[PDB]
Structure formats: structure tokens, C-alpha cells
Design an enzyme around this catalytic site. Structure first.
Site, PDB file in Angstrom:
ATOM      1  CD  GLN A  21      -2.398  -0.852   2.367  1.00 44.64           C
ATOM      2  OE1 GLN A  21      -2.569  -1.767   3.897  1.00 44.64           O
ATOM      3  NE2 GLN A  21      -3.746  -0.592   2.450  1.00 44.64           N
ATOM      4  NE  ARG A  78       0.580  -3.904  12.377  1.00 42.32           N
ATOM      5  CZ  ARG A  78      -0.161  -4.092  11.885  1.00 42.32           C
ATOM      6  NH1 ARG A  78      -1.438  -3.889  11.820  1.00 42.32           N
ATOM      7  NH2 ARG A  78       0.002  -6.003  10.917  1.00 42.32           N
ATOM      8  CG  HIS A 122      -0.014  -6.191   5.122  1.00 45.15           C
ATOM      9  ND1 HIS A 122      -0.916  -5.703   4.801  1.00 45.15           N
ATOM     10  CD2 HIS A 122      -0.286  -5.542   6.968  1.00 45.15           C
ATOM     11  CE1 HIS A 122      -2.072  -4.851   4.880  1.00 45.15           C
ATOM     12  NE2 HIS A 122      -1.412  -4.855   6.084  1.00 45.15           N
ATOM     13  CG  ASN A 167      -2.575  -7.367   7.734  1.00 42.76           C
ATOM     14  OD1 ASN A 167      -3.011  -7.388   7.029  1.00 42.76           O
ATOM     15  ND2 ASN A 167      -2.354  -6.786   9.538  1.00 42.76           N
ATOM     16  CD  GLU A 168      -6.512  -6.870   8.437  1.00 45.54           C
ATOM     17  OE1 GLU A 168      -7.297  -6.735   7.758  1.00 45.54           O
ATOM     18  OE2 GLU A 168      -7.313  -5.623   9.172  1.00 45.54           O
ATOM     19  CG  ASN A 309      -5.507  -5.644  12.000  1.00 48.80           C
ATOM     20  OD1 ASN A 309      -4.740  -4.877  13.382  1.00 48.80           O
ATOM     21  ND2 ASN A 309      -5.395  -5.227  11.035  1.00 48.80           N
ATOM     22  CE1 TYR A 311      -9.712  -1.282  10.292  1.00 45.93           C
ATOM     23  CE2 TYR A 311      -8.999   0.633  10.626  1.00 45.93           C
ATOM     24  CZ  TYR A 311      -8.793  -0.170  10.703  1.00 45.93           C
ATOM     25  OH  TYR A 311      -7.235  -0.228  10.179  1.00 45.93           O
ATOM     26  CD  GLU A 384      -5.352  -2.435  10.472  1.00 44.49           C
ATOM     27  OE1 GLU A 384      -5.328  -2.549   9.198  1.00 44.49           O
ATOM     28  OE2 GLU A 384      -7.096  -3.618  10.453  1.00 44.49           O
ATOM     29  CD1 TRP A 434      -5.317   2.449   8.052  1.00 41.94           C
ATOM     30  CD2 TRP A 434      -3.635   1.198   8.365  1.00 41.94           C
ATOM     31  NE1 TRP A 434      -4.570   2.231   6.771  1.00 41.94           N
ATOM     32  CE2 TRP A 434      -3.756   0.866   6.986  1.00 41.94           C
ATOM     33  CE3 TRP A 434      -2.624   0.651   8.687  1.00 41.94           C
ATOM     34  CZ2 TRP A 434      -2.871   0.408   5.892  1.00 41.94           C
ATOM     35  CZ3 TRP A 434      -1.866  -0.353   7.535  1.00 41.94           C
ATOM     36  CH2 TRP A 434      -1.589   0.052   6.303  1.00 41.94           C
ATOM     37  CD  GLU A 441      -8.298   0.366   2.723  1.00 45.13           C
ATOM     38  OE1 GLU A 441      -6.788   0.822   2.889  1.00 45.13           O
ATOM     39  OE2 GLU A 441      -9.118  -0.239   3.344  1.00 45.13           O
ATOM     40  CD1 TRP A 442      -6.020  -3.035   1.436  1.00 42.65           C
ATOM     41  CD2 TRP A 442      -4.884  -4.255  -0.184  1.00 42.65           C
ATOM     42  NE1 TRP A 442      -5.178  -3.710   2.003  1.00 42.65           N
ATOM     43  CE2 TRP A 442      -4.237  -4.633   1.228  1.00 42.65           C
ATOM     44  CE3 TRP A 442      -3.883  -4.673  -0.810  1.00 42.65           C
ATOM     45  CZ2 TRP A 442      -2.977  -4.225   1.330  1.00 42.65           C
ATOM     46  CZ3 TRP A 442      -3.023  -5.126  -0.450  1.00 42.65           C
ATOM     47  CH2 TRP A 442      -2.001  -4.802   0.557  1.00 42.65           C
TER      48      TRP A 442
END
Length: 478
Positions: A21, A78, A122, A167-168, A309, A311, A384, A434, A441-442
Site C-alpha cells: 500500500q 508497524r 501483509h 496480517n488478517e 485490528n 474499527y 490497527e 491506521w 486502500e486495496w
């Protein structure tokens, strides 16, 4: 107001990034192609038709960005290592220039007093391994990942003391292999016509199992060979929404719990208890792989810390798949739940730019207590947390910097976090926003701006501090 004193002595504050990213320089210094290069260069996969060939050019600009971190008094950063800069073909020939690059980054961070927290994976799998054996679908990924991890321990572990292997894995398994919205894009074509191949009922569980074993294999190498002399620690960053029951009924209360077990428990129950949650075994059946006894023994206890992570919070209700109709297996259907940010048409909170990101500060506190209770108080880092602005060409840069919504977001989520530690006894060790910088953003591309710093894509990637920069600076002042 919040201060460092609101948190335990030694509490770590940082910002987070990811290689694909941020870095750009995709064809520089021997870097191999990844599944995300392929994905970003395929029609239909990125909503704004963009790519991260350049991104924010952190590959070249990391020293500037380190200054931008130090300006706030950040303790840590990170970042992830691009596997394809280390082994361009996933295995085989080591790329010395990749090692030299991350050594420069690590040294530059440490010289400024900023601790590196390094993610090994990631999402940027070398395309060579996707071609060779369809990547995460094949058991070979386990040994290949572990070898890559070992090279990183060997090259960087004298300085890097905090590692995040993955990651995730939940996001990857679902978005990459059920929805096919993220690389490699795979799903049941009967469920989503845009996919070229895949199976939404089986592949996510295979990928998840391999992620779990891959971590365990890397952790065994770390513990047996590197930890005694290097004295660092290994964790994983789990994507975790908080879930509240959509109604005050035991059916929905249980559904919220079950949705959590299918999201976090899918991975954490193996790492803490040596097996998948019972609810997953029950509902997924033979499509859910089984650990052998030897595997369970390497998997159980393989985390030193839990990266969260986090949100947002959704409502969850019980759901039954339609008894009439041909069943197309998929992960949401397997949960026996539906989770939504609406109850009776009323949103759970204000929303950030991202269509999925609802602002629900209490979720942070609820989640910390949940993790403490279920897993017997493991050390946790918030790996995150943050929110995004839109990318709005109709406002001035000056107006784009006025991120009072983000300030409130960080304020409210951190206030909840501080309470979970001080009042509730949760063992939280650090917090990473984050993100440092607006970035790619992907599948949302450049349409989402998560940064504390605004990036002017129309003026050679110039960084400008949003108001949140001053807010963090004040917060972190010693």
C-alpha cells in the site's frame, strides 16, 4: 483529556503501514511480481482503476516519513516486509538488495528512537508461488512461508524484537477465496460471476488452516533457534469487528457470540486451545480441516501476543439459509448469522468514508474484555485502529486537512481503550493508528484516505499534516 499518563507506563504508541500500500518501486531492485500486482493490473478488480506501482513511494521516501513520525513523538512503526523483495520467486534465490533495503529502514527507524514492529505477511504473496501451487491452497506454503520467516529472523532479528507473522488471515480467507474481492480473486462463480475460478465453500477453510500451520511453523523456528538470543516476540494481527445482538433475545445474543467465534475464534481458538471452535466444527463439518495431534501441539500456545485490528461494531442476528433453493456453500452461510450496521433501519453510528466503517467507540472496550475473558488475559496490541476521509477533488487541500472527525474517532476509541486497561484490567501493551499516510486502500484504491498525513497525488506525493498530527503530538508529549 487523554495523555500518556492515561495509559500504563511503557505503553507503546505508533502508526501502521503495509508494503504494497506504501512502497511503490514495484519493479525496482529485483522485486518479484506478487498476486496483488497481478490483481491490480486486471480489469474490474480495483474500483477506481488504480494501482500501487508507485503508491506513496515510501521505498524511496522512508527517511522523510520517519521524520513525520518523530514529529508526533511516535514510539513505534508497524511496517511489512514484501516477501517478493526477499525471495522474488517465493523460494530459491535470496535477493540481497531486499535485505539491504529493510536493513536501511530498520536502522533509520532505530536511529530516530522508533521501534520497528514488523509484519512478515501483509497479503503480497509472490506470484511464482501462486503459479507453482496456487499459493495458500497448498500445504507447501507452510514450509515456504516458514523459510521466508527464518531468513527474516536471521537478517533482522538482532534489531527487530516485535514480529507479526500474518496480517488478517480472516480477511484473506474470506475476501480472497469466498467473495473474490481481494487477491487472488477466487470464489464460487455461481455465487459471484466475476470470479474466474474457486470454491467459496471449501477454499476459505483450506487457506485458513494453512495460515494457522504457517504461523506455527515460523513460531517453532523462532522459539527453537532465535528467541533465546534475540529476545523478541511473535504475534498475529487479527481483523475483529465487535458484534452486538440485533435484539435482546437469547437467539441473537448467541448469534453475536457465534459470529465472533467464526471471525476471531476461527484462528485464536486453535492458538489458545489447540482446535477450532466447536460451533465451526458443528456447522462446517467435513469442509473444516482437522489438526493432527502433532500439529495441535505446535499450534497451541504459538502466540506471544494478540494483535487486534479493530474499527467497528455491527449488530448480529441469527439466520437460517433458505430451506428451498440449491445451496451454494459460503462462509457467511456457515456462520448461521447475518451481521449488519443497522437495526430497524437505524445505523449503529456515524460512518467514516468506507462503506463498512461505522464509528462505535464502545466496541473497543467490549472487545478488549472479550479477549481477556476468552483467552485468559493474553498480551494484546491494537495493531490497527483509525478511519478514513473521502478523496474529494472538489475541496482544497486546506479543507482536506480539517480531520476533526478522525480526531474524535481516535479520542473516543482511545478513551475506551484506556478504560479497558485501567478499570477492566485488560493487558493492552500498545496502539497503532491506521495510517501514517494516505495510501492505496486495496480494491478501494486512492478513494479512501486513512492517513494522519494527507498525500497530494497530483503534486508528486507531497505530504501535508492533517489536524490529527497536532492532536497526536499533544497527546504524546512527555
Amino acid at each position: 483529556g487523554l495523555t500518556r499518563g492515561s495509559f500504563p507506563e511503557g505503553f507503546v504508541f505508533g502508526t501502521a503501514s503495509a508494503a504494497y500500500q506504501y512502497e511503490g518501486a514495484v519493479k525496482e531492485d529485483g522485486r518479484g511480481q506478487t498476486i496483488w500486482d497481478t490483481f491490480a493490473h486486471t480489469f474490474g478488480k480495483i474500483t477506481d482503476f488504480s494501482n500501487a506501482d508507485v503508491a506513496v513511494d515510501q521505498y524511496h521516501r522512508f527517511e522523510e516519513d520517519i521524520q513525520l513520525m518523530a514529529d508526533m513523538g511516535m514510539d513505534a512503526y508497524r511496517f511489512s516486509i514484501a516477501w517478493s523483495r526477499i525471495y522474488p520467486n517465493g523460494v530459491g534465490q535470496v535477493n540481497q538488495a531486499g535485505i539491504d533495503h529493510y536493513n536501511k529502514l530498520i536502522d533509520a527507524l532505530l536511529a530516530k528512537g522508533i521501534q520497528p514492529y514488523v509484519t512478515l505477511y501483509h497479503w503480497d504473496l509472490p506470484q511464482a508461488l501462486e503459479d507453482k501451487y496456487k499459493g495458500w491452497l497448498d500445504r507447501q506454503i507452510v514450509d515456504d512461508f516458514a523459510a521466508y520467516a527464518e531468513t527474516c529472523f536471521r537478517e533482522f532479528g538482532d534489531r527487530v524484537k516485535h514480529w507479526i507473522t500474518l496480517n488478517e488471515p480472516h480477511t484473506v480467507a474470506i475476501q480472497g477465496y469466498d467473495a473474490g474481492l481481494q487477491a487472488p480473486g477466487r470464489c464460487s462463480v455461481l455465487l459471484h460471476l466475476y470470479c474466474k475460478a474457486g470454491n467459496s465453500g471449501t477454499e476459505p477453510y483450506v487457506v485458513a488452516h494453512h495460515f494457522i500451520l504457517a504461523h506455527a511453523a515460523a513460531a517453532s523456528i523462532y522459539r527453537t533457534k532465535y528467541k533465546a538470543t534475540q529476545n523478541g516476540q511473535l504475534g498475529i494481527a487479527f481483523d475483529v469487528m465487535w458484534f452486538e445482538p440485533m435484539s435482546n433475545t437469547t437467539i441473537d445474543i448467541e448469534a453475536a457470540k457465534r459470529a465472533q467465534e467464526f471471525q476471531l475464534g476461527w484462528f485464536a481458538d486453535p492458538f489458545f486451545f489447540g482446535d477450532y471452535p466447536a460451533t465451526m466444527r458443528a456447522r462446517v463439518g467435513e469442509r473444516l480441516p482437522r489438526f493432527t495431534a502433532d500439529e495441535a501441539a505446535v499450534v497451541k500456545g504459538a502466540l506471544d501476543f494478540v494483535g487486534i485490528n479493530h474499527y467497528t461494531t455491527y449488530y448480529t442476528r441469527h439466520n437460517n439459509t433458505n430451506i428451498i433453493g440449491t445451496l451454494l456453500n459460503n462462509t457467511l452461510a456457515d456462520t448461521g448469522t447475518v451481521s449488519l450496521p443497522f437495526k430497524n433501519g437505524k445505523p449503529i453510528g456515524d460512518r467514516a468514508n468506507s462503506i463498512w466503517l461505522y464509528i462505535v467507540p464502545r466496541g473497543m472496550r467490549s472487545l478488549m474484555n472479550y479477549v481477556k475473558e476468552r483467552y485468559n488475559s493474553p498480551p494484546v496490541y491494537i495493531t490497527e485502529n483509525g478511519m478514513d476521509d473521502s478523496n474529494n477533488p472538489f475541496i482544497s487541500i486546506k479543507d482536506a486537512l480539517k480531520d476533526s472527525k478522525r480526531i474524535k474517532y481516535h479520542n473516543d476509541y482511545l478513551t475506551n481503550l484506556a478504560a479497558s486497561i485501567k478499570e477492566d484490567g485488560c493487558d493492552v501493551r500498545g496502539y497503532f493508528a491506521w495510517s501514517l499516510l494516505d495510501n492505496w486502500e486495496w480494491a478501494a484504491g486512492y478513494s479512501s484516505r486513512f492517513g494522519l498525513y494527507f498525500v497530494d497525488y497530483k503534486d508528486n506525493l507531497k505530504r501535508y499534516p492533517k489536524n490529527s498530527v497536532q492532536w497526536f503530538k499533544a497527546l504524546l508529549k512527555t
